[PDB]
C-alpha cells in the first residue's frame, strides 16, 4: 500500500527541479530513491503513477521534460512515469 501522501512527500524536494529544470538536489534524488524502494508491487507502481499524474495535473508549472528526466538525472531506475497524460493502467 502507498498513499499519495507518501508519494507526493517523497518528491516534495524535487519541485524546484520539476518547474525550473537543471540539476535535482541531493534530497530530491533521495526522494526518488524512496519512491523506487516503496513501489515493488504492480499495485504500488500503479498507485504511485496515479498520485504523480494527479500532482502533475494540479502543479501547472511542472515541465514535462524535467519530469521525464528526473529518474535518469538521479541515477534511479524508476519504473513509474510522471505526466498528467499517462495511462497508469498500462504500467507493468
Author numbering: 1 to 92
Publication text:
Lipid transfer proteins (LTPs), also called non-specific lipid transfer proteins (nsLTPs), are known for their ability to bind and transport hydrophobic ligands. The biological role of nsLTPs is still not well understood. They transport these lipids between biological membranes primarily for defense, including structural adaptation, antimicrobial activity, and pathogenic resistance. We elucidated the crystal structures of Act c 10.0101 and Pun g 1.0101, nsLTP allergens from gold kiwifruit and pomegranate, respectively. These allergens both belong to the subfamily of 9-kDa LTPs.
Act c 10.0101 crystallized in the P21 space group with two protein molecules in the asymmetric units. The model was refined to 1.95Å resolution. The crystal structure corresponds to a closed apo form of the protein. Both protein chains include residues 1–92 (mature form of the protein) that are folded into a compact, mainly α-helical structure that is characteristic for nsLTPs. The protein chains adopt very similar conformations and they superposed with Root Mean Square Deviation (RMSD) value of 0.3Å over 92 Cα. The Act c 10.0101 structure is stabilized by four disulfide bridges that are formed by the following pairs of cysteine residues: Cys4–Cys51, Cys14–Cys28, Cys29–Cys74, and Cys49–Cys88. We have identified three additional amino acids at the C-terminal end of the protein and modeled these amino acids as Lys-Ile-Ser, which is consistent with the sequence that is observed in homologous Act d 10.0101 and Act d 10.0201, as well as in agreement with the results of mass spectrometric analysis of the sample used for crystallization. The crystal structure revealed that Lys90 is solvent exposed, the side chain of Ile91 points toward the hydrophobic core of the protein, and the C-terminal carboxyl group of Ser92 forms a salt bridge with Arg45. The covalent ligand binding was shown in the case of oxylipin-conjugated barley 9-kDa LTP, where Asp7 of this nsLTP is responsible for the formation of the bond between the protein and lipid. This aspartic acid residue is conserved in Act c 10.0101 (Asp8), Act d 10.0101, Act d 10.0201, chickpea Cic a 3, tomato Sola l 7.0101, and wheat Tri a 14.0201, which suggests that these nsLTPs may have a similar mode of ligand binding and may also bind oxylipins. The difference in likely modes of ligand binding for Act c 10.0101 is not only related to the presence of the conserved aspartic acid residue in kiwifruit protein, but also the absence of a tyrosine residue in the Ω loop.
